């Protein structure tokens, strides 16, 4: 068997065969891990509904894990995609792993994308979505004291900013921040080592990074706007405890590190783990790469411990 294939098969075969004799087409379609060849972990329930907010409606997908009992701890998740791409489908596999292994109800938010909707549209969506869900904790049998925010890449950025906004606005209460190789920013006059080092050859490149910023931002001044680069916010005290995952061969590796330092500096509890042999966006390789698979579950296990 071809190297990669043998690996994916065991990864895809991990779960048994669904009781085909009693399987509906809609269910098969929602769970099929054939194309793309990415495994979709089973959860007890997946609901999709609309979130009517002022000026716009956001689609949402809720994942309730099997074996967990109410009140449920929860995670409001914002997908990655550099503020320009990604949707509920691209990160469906990721949310399933976080719900299943994190033992928490996950709410994946379909926030508005640039350039159609420039900064700070996504930021407003992230906060308002958190607020909408928190206001409806009972509706989802959630434990109000165990609602966390999180995201990968641009999504991690949104989760981090939402926490600050929630602090300034007086709420809602956030119990934890799950930041997966987040784009939390840095000072352009002090770009960390990794930015220069891993500029090319690892999926996320410098040319790509500038391009994404062009699509998302309106002016150069916004490069240091705290809602874009939260690491620059002057008062990170009182924020929710956080867990940050970084990838060794990721230009944003040191960016994640810089946020752990800023949070730590402000007296915020934070744990940062750097994953060896992985690149930016490794969550997308869940079920394909053994290392990525192990790392993403490790991240989900960190979420579980945090919301216990």
From TrEMBL:
Annotated Alpha/beta hydrolase fold-3 domain residues: 75-283
Nucleotide-binding found in the keyword field: no
Pfam families: Abhydrolase_3
InterPro entries: AB_hydrolase_3, AB_hydrolase_fold, GDXG_lipolytic_enzyme
Keywords annotated in UniProt: Hydrolase
SUPFAM superfamilies, A to Z: alpha/beta-Hydrolases
Family: Belongs to the 'GDXG' lipolytic enzyme family.
Protein name from the UniProt record: Hydrolase
Keyword Zinc in annotation: no
Recorded GO MF terms: hydrolase activity
Superkingdom of the organism of origin: Bacteria
